[PDB]
């Protein structure tokens, strides 16, 4: 079996592209092995229904990413934080795009990307919950953001929630991760007027004999 050892990373972090995990970009496996003390050292976050994202990725058996050309008109792409130091300076999840205002304007973002391929695509995105109201407006201008992601038949709208949280890596704000699978012939459309942590492409999905195992056994 192709045993790929996660070492200090958990599949999810390898997925999102936490810097210490970037070493797994594009990895495949028959059994991904997760260690008991693996840790996350990038922007604090959470995955509503984490067990399912882990399971489906664990079964897809591949982290093959494909960068697509999203066009984020009028917002400042690629936003790092020191909690996710990418080398000596600030960084962020290699697979997400932190969109923030440009100048003094965060325009309504409404983009789309069609699945013209013969395969299913998996889009990982997220929403940012600012610690305080200032941060909210300082970052996205409007006082209440919203992330609406949909395909032709499903939809998901997430409103961010402002508030303090336990300090983690110095931050008391968070990112909430979400996913959207887009079937061939379908089309993805992201619309948001603030707080979006934009995707960069799609991971390819496979159905095989793969899975993940929590183990501290020496390979």
């Amino acid at each position: 079996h192709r045993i790929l050892d996660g070492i200090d990373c958990t599949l999810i972090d390898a997925l999102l592209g936490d810097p210490h995990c970037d070493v797994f970009q594009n990895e495949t496996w028959d059994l991904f092995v997760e260690r008991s003390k693996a840790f996350s050292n990038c922007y604090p976050y959470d995955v509503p229904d984490y067990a399912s994202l882990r399971s489906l990725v664990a079964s897809s058996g591949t982290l093959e990413f494909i960068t697509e050309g999203f066009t984020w008109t009028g917002v400042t792409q690629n936003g790092g934080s020191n909690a996710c130091k990418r080398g000596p300076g600030s960084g962020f999840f290699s697979r997400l795009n932190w969109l923030t205002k440009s100048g003094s304007t965060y325009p309504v973002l409404n983009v789309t990307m069609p699945n013209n391929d013969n395969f299913d695509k998996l889009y990982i995105w997220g929403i940012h919950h600012p610690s305080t109201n200032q941060e909210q407006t300082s970052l996205y201008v409007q006082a209440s953001g919203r992330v609406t992601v949909s395909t032709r038949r499903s939809q998901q709208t997430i409103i961010p929630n402002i508030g303090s949280r336990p300090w983690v890596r110095g931050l008391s704000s968070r990112i909430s991760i979400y996913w959207t699978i887009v079937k061939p012939g379908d089309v993805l459309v992201i619309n948001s007027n603030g707080n979006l942590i934009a995707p960069r492409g799609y991971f390819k999905m496979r159905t095989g004999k793969s899975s993940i195992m929590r183990s501290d056994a020496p390979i």
Epitope: D5, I7, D8, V23, R35, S36, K37, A38, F39, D216, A217, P218, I219
Partner: antibody, heavy 118, light 106 residues
Framework: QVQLQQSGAELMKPGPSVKISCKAT????????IEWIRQRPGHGLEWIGE????????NFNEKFKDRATFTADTPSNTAYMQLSSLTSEDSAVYYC???????????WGQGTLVTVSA | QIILTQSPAIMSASPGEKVTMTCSAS?????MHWYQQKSDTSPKIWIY???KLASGVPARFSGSGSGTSYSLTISTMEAEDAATYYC????????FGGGTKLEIKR
């Protein structure tokens, strides 16, 4: 979170033995080999040996065999190295390190200055 | 046992100057690992598996080799690169090179 904390520097007379410790935290101790390398002033790096905690498959560099002694305690998550019958030639900085099978993940301890003298 | 004679022993270069240091095995190896070491600090993995960069290692670094001879080249020296570089064979009882002092000139 990975951190190998090593014991303080030493000073052992010529002939006895020093015992260096290295506490691992941030990763499952019994999963990876802990290796021992030393730095003698103007000599480079010298691979001493290694141990796989919990199995104690220890592999010595011939040069330190039955001289060097590797042990590792799971509950305390601490590996240890004992070098006996010292000469001034064993005065150096000893690092412990978890390089795993993928060196993208290698981690060396701060170092333990072992001074051999009367 | 698989002695690495990594040898430009000292190097003096100017900013932007390309640099290349070689390391040779006294037999045959599969991958070369390069640890960088600046003063009063533990070695840091810089380039593993002959050509892959560790996290954070600037892009101006690269590595190659495949048999006995291996190398570590730097497109354009920067002041921050002045360190001491060691090669590391892992194909048995691991061994390290003698290092290469990379001194910048200013």
């Amino acid at each position: 979170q990975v951190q190998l904390q090593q014991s303080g520097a030493e000073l052992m007379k010529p002939g006895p033995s020093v015992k260096i410790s290295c506490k691992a935290t941030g990763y499952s101790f019994s999963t990876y080999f802990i290796e021992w390398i030393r730095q003698r002033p103007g000599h480079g790096l010298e691979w001493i040996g290694e141990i796989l905690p919990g199995s104690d498959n220890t592999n010595f560099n011939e040069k330190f065999k039955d001289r060097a002694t590797f042990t590792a305690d799971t509950p305390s998550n601490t590996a240890y190295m004992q070098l006996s019958s010292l000469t001034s030639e064993d005065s150096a900085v000893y690092y412990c390190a978890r390089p795993t099978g993928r060196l993208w993940f290698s981690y060396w301890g701060q170092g333990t200055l072992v001074t051999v003298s009367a | 046992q698989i002695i690495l004679t990594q040898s430009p022993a000292i190097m003096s270069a100017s900013p932007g100057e390309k640099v290349t240091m070689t390391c040779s095995a006294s037999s045959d190896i599969s991958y070369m690992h390069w640890y960088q070491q600046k003063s009063d600090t533990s070695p840091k993995i810089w380039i593993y598996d002959t050509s892959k960069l560790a996290s954070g290692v600037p892009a101006r670094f690269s590595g190659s080799g495949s048999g006995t001879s291996y190398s570590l080249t730097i497109s354009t020296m920067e002041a921050e690169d002045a360190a001491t570089y060691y090669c590391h064979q892992r194909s048995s009882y691991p061994t390290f090179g003698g290092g290469t002092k990379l001194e910048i000139k200013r």
